[PDB]
Enzyme design. Structure first.
Site, PDB file in Angstrom:
ATOM      1  N   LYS A 141      -1.883  27.062 -39.279  1.00 49.08           N
ATOM      2  CA  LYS A 141      -1.247  26.965 -37.965  1.00 49.08           C
ATOM      3  C   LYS A 141      -1.814  28.028 -37.052  1.00 49.08           C
ATOM      4  O   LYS A 141      -1.728  29.232 -37.351  1.00 49.08           O
ATOM      5  CB  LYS A 141       0.264  27.146 -38.180  1.00 49.08           C
ATOM      6  CG  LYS A 141       1.111  27.142 -37.010  1.00 49.08           C
ATOM      7  CD  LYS A 141       0.945  25.841 -36.257  1.00 49.08           C
ATOM      8  CE  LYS A 141       2.011  25.850 -35.204  1.00 49.08           C
ATOM      9  NZ  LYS A 141       3.231  25.728 -36.080  1.00 49.08           N
TER      10      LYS A 141
ATOM     11  N   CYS B 261      -8.747  22.601 -25.551  1.00 46.74           N
ATOM     12  CA  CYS B 261      -9.492  21.472 -26.113  1.00 46.74           C
ATOM     13  C   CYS B 261      -9.989  21.709 -27.528  1.00 46.74           C
ATOM     14  O   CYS B 261     -10.457  20.737 -28.156  1.00 46.74           O
ATOM     15  CB  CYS B 261     -10.718  21.095 -25.251  1.00 46.74           C
ATOM     16  SG  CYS B 261     -12.108  22.297 -25.300  1.00 46.74           S
TER      17      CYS B 261
ATOM     18  N   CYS C  73      -8.455  28.097 -23.681  1.00 48.95           N
ATOM     19  CA  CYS C  73      -8.905  26.790 -24.138  1.00 48.95           C
ATOM     20  C   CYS C  73      -7.721  25.965 -24.667  1.00 48.95           C
ATOM     21  O   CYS C  73      -6.860  26.478 -25.377  1.00 48.95           O
ATOM     22  CB  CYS C  73      -9.974  26.997 -25.246  1.00 48.95           C
ATOM     23  SG  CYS C  73     -10.611  25.410 -25.925  1.00 48.95           S
TER      24      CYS C  73
HETATM   25  S1  FES Z   1     -13.500  25.169 -23.554  1.00 45.12           S
HETATM   26 FE1  FES Z   1     -12.321  24.816 -21.686  1.00 45.12          FE
HETATM   27  S2  FES Z   1     -10.369  23.971 -22.367  1.00 45.12           S
HETATM   28 FE2  FES Z   1     -11.604  24.246 -24.173  1.00 45.12          FE
END
Ligand code: FES
Ligand code: FES
Lengths: 63, 63
Positions: free
Chosen positions: A13, A32, A30
């Site tokens: 996690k 994403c 980030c």
């Molecule tokens: S590298 Fe920008 S949101 Fe993941």
């Protein structure tokens, strides 16, 4: 369909903590799971969205 | 393989901005794209990780 194929795959996690006193003017985080500078955004979201049609992007924390 | 099946699917790119002066003691931000309280975490990551074997979790911003 898991979301993370890159970050700390040994971990059960992944929770990151940052203190506002480390943001400075602003930081981009980030969401994403592809950044090479985790937990910060490094622009890798753009290639991901182009390839997949996705629309994900970072959280900007500002001062 | 897109990551976001839920949040603002009309948008081309989801970037959220928060000011540190809205964090209070702390806030947890969603990085799994399943929260019903986007952009905040609402615990939906737990069911996602159980179902998929994933390990994603929120960013905690503290003061
Ligand atoms: S590298 Fe920008 S949101 Fe993941
Ligand atoms: S609900 Fe998405 S990271 Fe917790």
């Amino acid at each position: 369909a898991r979301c993370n194929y890159k970050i700390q795959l040994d971990s059960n996690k992944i929770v990151d903590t940052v203190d506002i006193e480390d943001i400075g003017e602003k930081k981009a985080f980030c969401r994403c799971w592809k950044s090479e500078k985790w937990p910060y955004c490094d622009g890798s979201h753009g290639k991901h969205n182009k390839e997949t049609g996705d629309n994900v992007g970072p959280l900007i924390v500002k001062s």
